[PDB]
Amino acid sequence: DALRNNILAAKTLAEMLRSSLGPKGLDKMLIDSFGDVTITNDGATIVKDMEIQHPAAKLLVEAAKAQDAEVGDGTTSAVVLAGALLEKAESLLDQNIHPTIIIEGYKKAYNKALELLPQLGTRIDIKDLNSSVARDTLRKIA
Amino acid sequence: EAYANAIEGLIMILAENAGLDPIDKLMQLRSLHENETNKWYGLNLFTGNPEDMWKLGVIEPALVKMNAVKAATEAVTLVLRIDDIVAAG
Amino acid sequence: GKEALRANIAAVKAIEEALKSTYGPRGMDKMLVDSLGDITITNDGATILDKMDLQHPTGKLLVQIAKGQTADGTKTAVILAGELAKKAEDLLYKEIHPTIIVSGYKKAEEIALKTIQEIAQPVTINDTDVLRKVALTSLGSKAVAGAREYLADLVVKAVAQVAELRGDKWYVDLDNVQIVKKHGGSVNDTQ
Amino acid sequence: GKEALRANIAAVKAIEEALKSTYGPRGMDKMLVDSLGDITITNDGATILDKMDLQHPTGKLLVQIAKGQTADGTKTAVILAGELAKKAEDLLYKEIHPTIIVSGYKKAEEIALKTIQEIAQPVTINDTDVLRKVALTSLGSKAVAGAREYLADLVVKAVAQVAELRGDKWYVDLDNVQIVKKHGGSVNDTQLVYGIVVDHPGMPKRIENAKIALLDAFLEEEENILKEKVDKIAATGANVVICQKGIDEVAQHYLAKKVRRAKKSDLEKLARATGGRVISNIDELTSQDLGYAALVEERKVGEDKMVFVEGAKNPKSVSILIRGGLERVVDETERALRDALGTVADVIRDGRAVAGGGAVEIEIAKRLRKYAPQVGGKEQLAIEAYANAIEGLIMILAENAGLDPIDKLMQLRSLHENETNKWYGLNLFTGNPEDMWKLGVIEPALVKMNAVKAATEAVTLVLRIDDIVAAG
Amino acid sequence: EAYANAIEGLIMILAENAGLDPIDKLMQLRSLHENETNKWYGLNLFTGNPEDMWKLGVIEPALVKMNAVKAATEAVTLVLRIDDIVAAG
Amino acid sequence: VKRSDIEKLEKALGARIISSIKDATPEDLGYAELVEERRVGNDKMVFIEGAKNLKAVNILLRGSNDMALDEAERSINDALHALRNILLEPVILPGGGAIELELAMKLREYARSVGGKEQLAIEAFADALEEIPLILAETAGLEAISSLMDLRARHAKGLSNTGVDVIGGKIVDDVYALNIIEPIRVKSQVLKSATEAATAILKIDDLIAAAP
């Protein structure tokens, strides 16, 4: 029940950044309590500057901040995902499945996915710019 | 289309503030502006009837109109782009 | 988060309603009331938006936007934005994602600016009748006590001085215009 | 005065419920909330009981009891006491006088300790696999970010140093273990140091054969006094100088021409390791109070400066640097490592170990049921109830793993009819019963014994007290 | 897929009424029915474990099962097809 | 030139700001591989090339307006950061939610070979990943449902590169062709931190009142 509340806290937080995802990510308006404002669809900025309420949500914020710290690009993508995991977990709780089981399941799934990431990854050619292979790649990513 | 209507809203309100029937005058002007040669015709509020607004010295800077459109568009898009409001620090 | 959006739209609609009736060359006046009890009766929209008791963030924002780049035109921008907001609402009820409405409005904006650019009648500093007309345009409905064709003269005479041509465009340094006021007689004593 | 007793039992049951779900190698975490708004998420039971907002006298008492003699085991004691309290309640409803229940429980305690003493498998400091297993035992469920088989290494390596044999038993002076922490990377960056570690251009750095000054302690006049104080210290031949109180930067300049630390818990172990002693007033300072450190130095933690006292005289010296990301991680790492150190230390000092998974428990229950009919009527029931209360631990342990309690209890009970399955316990990840010894689920007998002992003591105390009175 | 799950619901409830853990037994049977040679395996409620239900004499008429499926489908579709309830005369 | 400019120059150039030429010496003499008065938008400028410690490459950013200026700077910055992220780990992933779907398929396949309640936990991990394609498309105003099933169809029966072009607002059979690319270094970390988060949330039993 308290677990479900935490889940709802993190979930409700994730619900907001659901819309700020990807290119068409909708804006979020941050009110700097000093009597100022800044708007953005950026996960980092939002999660950082926002003054979060619930502890669980604060922990999710913490996770996101770590996620940003390690690398800049993906931050919201993590939060939305976390929210999705919890939302899918609360459906298994209704199946009367103890949290620890779900946790282990998620761990295994994570490890397997982590293993599968490179398996499904397309390695590139970085052997010089003489060839222009790198340029085409760099052009695509650009 | 909605944008166009929203623009016509200005003519309507302009008619309202003069104590005239909005829709009728809108329709009148719309009917008049089917002719290439009535591209200046607007609403004479004192007279009450549509008239060529250029001869009556009802002239305004294009830049003002453009800027108004621009800023209004920007404002509304900003309103629509924002999904939620958050307190920060 | 529709609940947060509708409030914004409501704010915009509120400010529209605030400045609505002031619009036009027969625009009614609004009576501003300070908490002190003092008051300010005015038609000008900018002034209203300045002295107005702003409530919503989106509101203060909208005001901040309508006043950006030319005092007038704010009226138009505000009311237009209000209309667009209302019609957007009408479109939203039809379950249309905002990013579509935005794009549409942007296209419409482009076509609109094309339209104005197309229609526009080129004018010069020499066509003083135009300058007079444009002056008199905004002056209508101001409830100024006469001398419109004289104040317009002063304007036409004023802008003429503050103008020098380096190249294609005269550099009208508007900031060189001092403005003071005193009581006595009428606006025919303006000079 | 049943009305006063029931409240005590309720308090004990409340604390049980507080620490219940934290139990086991799949124990969930509790979120502690300070009135400030700050929070502390943790599995460790002692920490909870520390930071917990204690209400009842009997509660604070119970906590005071469960923490007495080794950080872990508290969990077991508390929950056990809770079960015993509940079963005692069940017995009380049957109109049985407390002094009977107490006696019964005492007998049961004796038989239990006999049982543990009997089952126990003798071990030595050489059986390092056991030490590793015991370390890893408590480390499970800590939510520590990996390196369990490495942290366990550090533990095994740590306890090894702090150990010297005067006679039959090695004197593992656990208090010589310094513990600090910093952020950055992960717990793979955790690392031991033989000497103690402590978190201006100043005095020289690499001091070989260093003498260490350990000291807990109009403007012009004050300057003269302070300089006098510094010179006094300088006149004793002190290489490196340590303090606790704030030092005027002028004295830092002085000494630089000849740190203020923060905690005395470090200065303590510094005094322990260096062989020197702390002085309250520098007026009494001599040259013998200076500690010997063969190769003192300083090093940079990725984000901070840090002090190292390497080459400390005493053989039994050791410190560990903890590393990680978030606070919860490094904290849980600290507490977990403390638990590990405790368990392993007790294994070494005692020299006996048993299997977890509730093997010892169902064994004890199995024994008690046999011994129960051999005594009187009303005591027999108390003893039986004691056994059940013990089985409660296995059941709760099953609960915390997302398993059906009763089924697994019955399974283990059925299995423990064979002399040759006295180690069989509950594999929580697998879900099925298995020999807990091969799986490295090993714990110190002394811990189990102590848990039983303290729980018994607590519950008897709860039952002995008839009413609560305000005094002066 | 939902239909399939709804069918599995029967096994689950059947497990419930026997004092067994539904999901575990469902998963067990699901795992067992990966083999062509266990197409008869079902849930022994007294034993508690999965077993070949044919040898244990747990046999039923195919027609009954078919009819049950048929009627249930018909019922639910009827429930879903009806949009509103009206009083007539 | 400005003091702030010359101070920067001397350290690279290995030279020293001479206070007085009478006391000067070749010790203060710097060096560069090439120097050239080059035309830059009808504005002649002195270019210095490959001198001593090259350190950073200098961009002259010619902005006709502060907006386009900051915009160009921003663009270059983002591009650089992203390219850095992909370059650190030279493996690209099909963006637009494709890799998530692929993983979901593989994770269901993997979930099948695990039993017990964990088969449902893993399958529930897959169902979460698929929320990214769902949400990501939804932002483009596409139906959150039909898009996902269309994707599943195209995916299970086709290339793993099937994804969602949000810009164009359409489902793409191969997102690499539309130049939708995601670094692995980011993805794995996202996965990690997300898992850690959801885990840490699920692991907490309840709240307890404490004392500071």
Ligand SMILES: Nc1ncnc2c1ncn2[C@@H]1O[C@H](COP(=O)(O)OP(=O)(O)O)[C@@H](O)[C@H]1O
């Ligand atoms: N790997 C394991 N398998 C089965 N039971 C275990 C395992 N590790 C610990 N236990 C059980 O957990 C209990 C102690 O749990 P707890 O006190 O919550 O954690 P800690 O041992 O860290 O203090 C013991 O009774 C023991 O039987």
